[PDB]
Write a protein that binds this ligand. Sequence first.
Ligand code: 1SY
Ligand code: 1SY
Lengths: 326, 326, 326, 326, 328
Amino acid sequence: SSLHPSIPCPRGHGAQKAALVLLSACLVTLWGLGEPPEHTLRYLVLHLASLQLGLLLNGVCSLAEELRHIHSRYRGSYWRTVRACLGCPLRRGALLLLSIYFYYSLPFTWMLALLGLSQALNILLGLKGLAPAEISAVCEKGNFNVAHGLAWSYYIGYLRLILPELQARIRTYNQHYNNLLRGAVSQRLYILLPLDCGVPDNLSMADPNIRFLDKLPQQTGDRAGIKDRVYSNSIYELLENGQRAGTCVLEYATPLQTLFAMSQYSQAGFSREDRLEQAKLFCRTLEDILADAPESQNNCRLIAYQEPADDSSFSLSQEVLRHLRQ
Amino acid sequence: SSLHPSIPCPRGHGAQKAALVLLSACLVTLWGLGEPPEHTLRYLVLHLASLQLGLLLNGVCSLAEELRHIHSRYRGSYWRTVRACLGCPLRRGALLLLSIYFYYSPFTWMLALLGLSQALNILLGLKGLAPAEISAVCEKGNFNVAHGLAWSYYIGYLRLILPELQARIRTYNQHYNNLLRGAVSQRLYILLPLDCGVPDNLSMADPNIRFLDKLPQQTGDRAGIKDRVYSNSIYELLENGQRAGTCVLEYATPLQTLFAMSQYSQAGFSREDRLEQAKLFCRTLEDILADAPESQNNCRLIAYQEPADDSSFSLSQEVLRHLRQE
Amino acid sequence: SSLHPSIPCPRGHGAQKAALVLLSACLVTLWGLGEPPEHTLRYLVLHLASLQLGLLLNGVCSLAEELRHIHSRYRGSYWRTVRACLGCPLRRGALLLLSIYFYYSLPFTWMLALLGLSQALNILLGLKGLAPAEISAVCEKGNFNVAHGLAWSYYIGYLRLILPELQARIRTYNQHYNNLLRGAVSQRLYILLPLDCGVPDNLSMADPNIRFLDKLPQQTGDRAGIKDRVYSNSIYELLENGQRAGTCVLEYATPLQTLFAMSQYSQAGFSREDRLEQAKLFCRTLEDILADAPESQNNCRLIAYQEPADDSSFSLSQEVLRHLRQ
Amino acid sequence: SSLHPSIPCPRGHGAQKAALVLLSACLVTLWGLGEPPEHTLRYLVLHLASLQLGLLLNGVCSLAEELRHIHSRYRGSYWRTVRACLGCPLRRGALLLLSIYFYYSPFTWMLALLGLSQALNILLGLKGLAPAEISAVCEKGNFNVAHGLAWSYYIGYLRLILPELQARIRTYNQHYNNLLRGAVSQRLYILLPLDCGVPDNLSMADPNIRFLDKLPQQTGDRAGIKDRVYSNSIYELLENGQRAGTCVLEYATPLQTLFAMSQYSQAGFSREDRLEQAKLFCRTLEDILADAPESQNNCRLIAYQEPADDSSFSLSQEVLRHLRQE
Amino acid sequence: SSLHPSIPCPRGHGAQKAALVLLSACLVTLWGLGEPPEHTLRYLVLHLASLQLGLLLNGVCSLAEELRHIHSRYRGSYWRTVRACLGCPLRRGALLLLSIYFYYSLPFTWMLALLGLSQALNILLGLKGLAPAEISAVCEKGNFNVAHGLAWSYYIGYLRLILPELQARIRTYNQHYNNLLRGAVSQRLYILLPLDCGVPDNLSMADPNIRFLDKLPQQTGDRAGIKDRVYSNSIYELLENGQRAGTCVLEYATPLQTLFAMSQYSQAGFSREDRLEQAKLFCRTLEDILADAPESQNNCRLIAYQEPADDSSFSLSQEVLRHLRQEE
Ligand SMILES: Nc1nc(=O)c2ncn([C@@H]3O[C@@H]4COP(=O)(O)O[C@H]5[C@@H](O)[C@H](n6cnc7c(N)ncnc76)O[C@@H]5COP(=O)(O)O[C@@H]3[C@@H]4O)c2[nH]1
Ligand SMILES: Nc1nc(=O)c2ncn([C@@H]3O[C@@H]4COP(=O)(O)O[C@H]5[C@@H](O)[C@H](n6cnc7c(N)ncnc76)O[C@@H]5COP(=O)(O)O[C@@H]3[C@@H]4O)c2[nH]1
């Protein structure tokens, strides 16, 4: 939200207000007409009970398929494999008893046969699907994305490991290896987030002004059974109108390159328009992660930019220098 | 279906078979009863029309939410919003027209009742999804963290280190490794525990694993980072105090990420989800490496489960077993 | 209440005055309408009696579960099991007998079945819960917080042990070890309570002026099976506009660090919006405890501060000096 | 569940089973009696609506108290106060609007009676909670003293000293310990008396306990204090006057805090609450240490209950047993 | 309770069971006669309302006096006086407001005048008093006894100060001045609790077989502005049929001497039956206090004895001797 305006805000409570308005409208419409109050209640109760009897058939149909993986997903317990499909077997049983009592006392098997036939037609023809705007809410409320996992892996593997040790290297470099004639490299490690999934291997391209300057001292650790895992960084110069203007550290994000490469392979099943919404979500998730980390923005900065379609004299140098202003 | 018996198989079509059995039973029961089919046809058409109108009302209520995110999610276009909320404007309109044309088969009273019921369902949250259906749609649409983690792993590590492993092994064996020392074999062995407990070093939890020597590095450039390094390790296997063989051992860092996500509260990632994604990650790697150009001829996958009773389980014996049939 | 304006005051009697106003209004309304005064009394009695016959059903439903932990919670007493669920078994028995007499003489079996259905549906569907502002009163009236235990632990373990002997160390240091060139360290050990639970390890950070000077002679004791438990403190200087202003003894409060760290683990079940309410309650409990302690405020000072979000030129040195003025 | 049989198990689902049995009996009784179901539906709906109106009136009465803490507890917002007192404004509004519409199934007279009865309940204190319901809500929501104490213990002591215990023990054995003296085993032993009577030194309560020597210290910086120190001890176990072995012993200090909280009158802490919290603290530590990375492989828990008849209970045997099956 | 059979046990719930039996009998009797339940309920309501209106008049009469000590007992607040006299002003106000409505709709000023006369006659004549068996109940419930204060004073002033150091004092006396030729002084200080409050000054009297041998090393402390307060004890020996049987550390209980001496002065207002009532409650409270103290029963416990009415050759030497036997 605060990085770039095109980042969507989290979904809120907007359907509920529309539901309230619709409820009030239908209630006043019922009041304006002539019909007994008891008949409306009875019909509403029957409709509600039918909508609940229409889910047990779907649950049994789903169980008829889920029972084949009892030894692979539900250990060996029938209680778990029935709880995974038919909600909770305690509320559901009472609801079933009440529904059958209200449906049997108020041609009885005819309705059962018709409900079964309708449910079978719905499940076979596939009429009961999910809208694209509802999947995007169910898979975002429950964290069912790829960007969430990528952001958490990035944080855990890189930021939780180099950020505390960042100052101890730059401070030593600025005195031992950096000449007093050259300006000292700035703090606040900078990460660039191109909202296009285009991550060049080298930073020299796409901007003829930034040039590779020097190295940084490396650090060593033990991870996942492999020792001497070396982390190294680099420093780039900023040439403004042909003359040096400042120095900093520029970083891309490898997960963006991974998202870009996913859209090309056929086995991935990743569409071209998915790697854009995931790219948008990744930045928000990473910013949220960094907001409350103990190693806060005191050592890092984020830069998000969208490449103009008309090439309105856009240059990375202007953005990075404007960031270096703060 | 070969790495471990506990890995589940993809879902089949048992739901369709259960649906067909239910449809046959309903048709037989209706045939047994005495009634003309015209009434059944009329009632089925009315039920389908009611379901269509309910879906339309639900979509209309949902439309009130995404209209505030139009400038960021769906762009300034007013058509993509309705296309996402509904799915197909033309088909939806045709279906609505067909459904409302059969009103001749107190007319607004039914519409008011349907609206009232739909608003109640929206407000009270009675239209939730069982976990067995959420998992099904997520697996169908590739909405798992494990899928993204596996693809990132394959693109970033295996696709870069697999081709050069043979050359590195041969050069190490010729230049440094002696004839007295057992020659390091090919087919890099990857350890994939289905518990996500990844120790920092292999020396612990197995006294018979000892570090032997390192291996030459490799240099590359990625995401603007100059001179990215990669490293490996060589470990020796001891059998009753005597050496039995030598190979190259590795864990899976994404398993470490999956384990670490479950402890933080901001990740919102549970404990059983850890096991389920752990089991799915190995399946995804097997599927990806099944037809990868750098196929299984260059690396082997080992999946093991720690026994609950701790019946003297040794990883050295496990890896030696796969070493025998190398 | 006197530390910071943000600290809440104890809950009082406002619900009682609102209840009195509602009682008067409803009494006047009843007087203004036309109905026999006997009917009002009879209906009020019947309502009050049904609300008491509807509590034994809940009590028995609870006692169906409380009898499984008899040997582990209630020794072996059937009398003490029914005393934890059903209040007191004498007043309750008399109330039951009177309720039956009143409800039986004023289709009697019909009402019992309806009460049973209503109570069972309340228990199953969960319609009878607690608002967040009634739990917050019932668990604060009876001292059911985390901050209560943490504050009493802090007192008992630290301040009941070091405060009385704080004079005999400062006095010895000031004259044997403190040079006459340096100003004497002031009395009244100062405690900082950040209402953010963000507790840095070293005091040099977060304010570039306070700098570590030296230590104090330590004291020892034997506690809980460990002998020679060591307590030590430290002395900090306050540099004003480049020059020294005074000296004091500075401490954070470690239970705040515990409250912060609890909110990041997943098994804690302790939210990010809770460790601010508890942080504001811990300070109140400490102030109340130290108000009446014999080792009173003549030896310690409390400083509560909330970090501005806009960075309104806040410096801890200014607040510490302001309190040192007195 | 293994530490001692007296430790309770977490609450299950007996209330729901009893509720189902009660609902089934009520439904069967209603079927046995002769009456149309429409009356049952009407009366059930009316009862539920009256309950909802009563809850709303109670919420409005409670709102008269939380509006004088707006600038301290709920921030400058008027919506959080209502959300806390009521719970869900949109759902509450829908439920109220649907509830009052069913009055058509002297109308202000019933509202006056409901208000009068609710005011009587508030004033006279007739809606209190039995202790076995307060206990249930507290244990569900983690509103215990022992929860905070156990998490404080784990974060402040064990998570800091457990990794280095092996190194300290090994250095003590190599540098100082002789071969003639028995080797001190691993696995720091923690005694958890479920009586909160913690003696100052173990030389009392068992003549067979003799202090042998100390262990090398540990040093760190925490909360602005320079060089906090940690220390442990080594004890010798005598069998019939002869040495049998050695171990590293400790009590649990939070038990001492729990005991000392119950003597003061300001704490408001009873003498049965002490035993309940003491038996809950052990359960919480066992849960925490079950899945920690520094698991039970470095420490052991010993819970013992002092016999009432004093049947010659010797703590040395209790320690020696676990030493045997180490 | 377990100290002597004569010590009473705290009151429980017998009035409540009698109340349930009475309630059930009254309910059955009402069911056994012909009368509409409407009358049976409205008469009960009127009875309760009249009782509440009477309580308020009594409270106002009391407030007319309690408002005079306003600057001495209730600081300066007109509201704490009302809180002390008339219970709680909100519940009481609600009960008033509800009581009027039922008693005004169900000759209305006449009944108010009759209630006023009845309440004034009760206050003046004194018909409403308290039986001596419920004053005792409320005093014992709220801890309004002389013996409560005396027992807590005894504990806090003496035992909490000397019990921990008794072991060191005994040990030093044993290795320094005590010879192994004689019996070593046993541990576990013994306290005698005569339930007659007759405490003689010197233990040599009232039993010729108790003779005083030696003192004990002193203990010194500072208390309440007095420098160097000192404590000392004495050691006694028990002679069996002319032969020494053992050695103990004997003591009476001084608060018993205070309870006895308080009953001779006429200004104290302390009777001779009250002395016996309090002497059996001081022991109960002291044992309850010593049961849950860290300086527990391992350092000392009590010995209660009642002098026989017939004087059947009592010998407290036998009692202390048998306690010595049961110690081992
Ligand atoms: N700028 C930069 N410098 C680094 O050294 C570095 N190392 C990792 N990263 C990125 O942070 C995250 C950490 O990945 P993780 O360890 O969880 O899984 C890693 C790991 O399983 C494997 N892998 C990558 N590099 C190595 C390596 N040297 N050794 C072993 N495994 C490796 O491939 C996965 C993804 O790596 P990248 O897809 O290139 O980007 C990573 C990743 O997004 C780095 N980014
Ligand atoms: N600044 C500072 N210096 C101290 O010496 C100190 N000692 C205690 N405290 C804090 O006061 C309270 C009393 O500690 P307690 O013994 O009751 O529980 C302690 C105790 O059970 C255990 N523990 C801590 N330090 C030791 C220690 N050296 N040895 C044994 N156990 C220890 O871990 C619990 C929590 O310790 P902290 O969470 O770091 O904060 C403590 C605590 O809140 C201190 N605070």
